[PDB]
Design a protein around this ligand. Structure first.
Ligand code: SF4
Ligand code: SF4
Ligand code: SF4
Ligand code: SF4
Ligand code: FES
Ligand SMILES: [Cl-]
Ligand SMILES: [Mg+2]
Ligand SMILES: [Mg+2]
Length: 573
């Protein structure tokens, strides 16, 4: 056993763990900054977690294991002096102007500055702020006037994606973070998934803003602005209005969007049902033609970029169905004018996404037809929250309203898209009915749900057995391929999400304090909202969506054929 003294208190423990973890488990406060995801910044450690160990001196609690005999002090003057000094030195390289800053209300660094009453020795007031900012990407932006060089984004990129597309760089003799060779992220192997943003404790990493695109369209007299939110938004955005975690705020969102001036309130879950119509039809076709196998989902643009950059030989195996965002957008410029009288050129289609990579997808040159973009702007969950707050809309006290039904109705299958395994489960519900020409009652595929990184199942479709896999996070895609797991059997249908947990954990989602992440499983609680909707919806299959059925009957025809196949599909070359 080990006997540990912390701040005069004796502990007897068998645990093999760090001082930081042991202290935290025993209600002893130790600050941290560069420690996250069970890693710290191994070179140029932040030292905010400093403690004193008798007989050794000052040590970093976050990467020092407890040893029998240690006597530790976490709150001596020497300790607080050192921590304050490191915060002061960070302020010397930080444009400390919180007023207009997009992390003003939830900044980890600000909290530490306040906790230790630190001040800069010489305030940093960049003039060529141009020099510190990189806005070239369609999805990410960097503001180095805020960057603490804490490495959390580099560590998060490595762990979440294994691309190491975010790097430390030596730029004219100063250390920065950025992409390979200081290129635009979009021109590197980066997936544009934004996990580096989620990991950042300050406003040094952000999404590429579309808020001006949106406001300009809202204010243009002749534009008719459609808005449609992703599955995950309704499970998440309430966090930023102090409503807590796991709160379903669907109806409040619809009201807020009307109060912001949007002209039509639809829902990307309608697009999710459309993607299932096309993709489940495609799966049945591929079964009847014995391939090609495996078919991969094509709805996650982080995964599409991963395939493009590392597995281009798989691009032809991706489903040709457009993603819910792009398939909805295509219909918003074709079907929707046909049922409304709008001039298609005057329709401006906005989505709200938990995702930064969706901005790149929407701006792909060929995601348009007859000069009309499928999707004209994409705002993240965070961006919508800012728009609501800037307009002084009292979100938490809004009454519930409904979407406009024509492209707004959704089934429970579409509702679960935002969780890892949701697309797989939704697609199987329709594919099995399609293949067996039946209306089956057992529709729940629990085996593909949850947070395991690589999940598989055998499913029986029309009296034959098929193998499916759900790949949960970009790093797990690499593991699945490089390990040869793909070779252990013939897989027929594989879901891939780049963000572990699915889109509920996407790079456009609300930041969560690392100490809130110790008390809340964010991936599970956000997903729970979506499964709950599925459980209480009357229609739980995409092909039972009444508004969608009318759309195919009256405009697109049979899925996966004819008109449907000509404009609702996309292949990467
Ligand atoms: S990143 Fe945090 S400390 Fe820095 S200016 Fe923004 S809110 Fe203030
Ligand atoms: S967007 Fe994703 S892949 Fe690109 S640097 Fe950030 S974490 Fe890495
Ligand atoms: S961008 Fe953010 S996470 Fe990355 S080193 Fe700078 S402060 Fe840390
Ligand atoms: S998992 Fe969802 S949020 Fe993450 S990159 Fe893919 S589409 Fe975007
Ligand atoms: S938090 Fe321990 S060195 Fe940064
Ligand atoms: Cl309508
Ligand atoms: Mg370390
Ligand atoms: Mg307007």
């Amino acid at each position: 056993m080990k006997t540990i003294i912390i701040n005069g208190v004796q502990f007897n423990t068998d645990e093999d763990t760090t001082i930081l973890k042991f202290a935290r488990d025993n209600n002893i406060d130790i600050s941290a900054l560069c420690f996250l995801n069970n890693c710290n910044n191994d070179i140029n450690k932040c030292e905010i977690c400093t403690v004193e160990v008798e007989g050794t001196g000052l040590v970093t609690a976050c990467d020092t294991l407890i040893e029998d005999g240690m006597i530790i002090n976490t709150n001596s003057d020497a300790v607080n002096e050192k921590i304050k000094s490191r915060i002061s030195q960070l302020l010397d390289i930080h444009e400390f102007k919180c007023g207009p800053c997009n992390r003003r209300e939830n900044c980890e660094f600000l909290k530490l500055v306040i906790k230790y009453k630190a001040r800069a020795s010489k305030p940093f007031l960049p003039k060529d702020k141009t020099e510190y900012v990189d806005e070239r990407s369609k999805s990410l932006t960097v503001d180095r006037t805020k960057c603490l060089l804490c490495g959390r984004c580099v560590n998060a990129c490595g762990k979440n994606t294994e691309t190491y597309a975010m790097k430390f760089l030596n730029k004219n003799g100063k250390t920065i973070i950025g992409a390979e060779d200081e290129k635009c992220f979009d021109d590197t192997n980066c997936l544009l998934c934004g996990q580096c943003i989620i990991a950042c404790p300050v406003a040094a990493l952000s999404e590429k803003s579309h808020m001006d695109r949106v406001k300009n369209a809202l204010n243009a007299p002749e534009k008719h602005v459609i808005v449609a939110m992703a599955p995950s938004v309704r499970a998440s955005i309430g966090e930023l209005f102090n409503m807590g975690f796991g709160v379903d705020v669907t109806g409040k969102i619809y009201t807020a969007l009307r109060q912001l001036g949007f002209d039509k309130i639809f829902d990307i879950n309608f697009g999710a049902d459309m993607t299932i119509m096309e993709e489940a039809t495609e799966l049945v076709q591929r079964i009847e033609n014995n391939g090609p196998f495996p078919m991969f989902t094509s709805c996650c643009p982080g995964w599409v970029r991963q395939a493009e950059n590392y597995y281009p030989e798989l691009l032809n195996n991706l489903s040709s169905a457009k993603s819910p965002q792009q398939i909805f957008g295509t219909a918003s410029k074709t079907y929707y004018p046909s049922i409304s009288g709008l001039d298609p050129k005057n329709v401006f289609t906005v989505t709200v996404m938990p995702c930064t990579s969706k901005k790149f997808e929407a701006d792909r040159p060929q995601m348009e037809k007859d000069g009309l973009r499928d999707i004209d702007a994409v705002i993240t969950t965070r961006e919508l929250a800012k728009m609501i707050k800037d307009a002084k809309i009292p979100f938490a006290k809004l009454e519930d309203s409904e979407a406009d039904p024509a492209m707004g109705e959704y089934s429970g299958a579409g509702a679960i898209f935002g969780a890892t395994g949701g697309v797989m489960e939704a697609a199987l519900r329709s594919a099995k009915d399609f293949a067996e020409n039946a209306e089956l009652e057992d529709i729940e595929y629990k085996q593909v749900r949850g947070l395991n990184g690589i999940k598989e199942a055998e499913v029986e479709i029309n009296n034959n057995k098929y193998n499916v896999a759900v790949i949960n996070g970009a790093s797990n895609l690499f593991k699945f391929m490089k390990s040869g797991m793909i070779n252990e059997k013939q897989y027929h249908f594989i879901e891939v999400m780049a963000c572990h947990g699915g889109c509920v954990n996407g790079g456009g989602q609300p930041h969560v304090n690392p100490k809130d992440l110790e008390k809340v499983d964010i991936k599970k609680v956000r997903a729970s909202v979506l499964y709950n909707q599925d459980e209480h919806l009357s229609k739980r299959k995409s092909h039972e969506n009444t508004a969608l059925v009318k759309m195919y009957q009256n405009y697109f025809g049979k899925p996966g054929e004819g008109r449907a196949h000509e404009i609702l599909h996309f292949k990467y070359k």
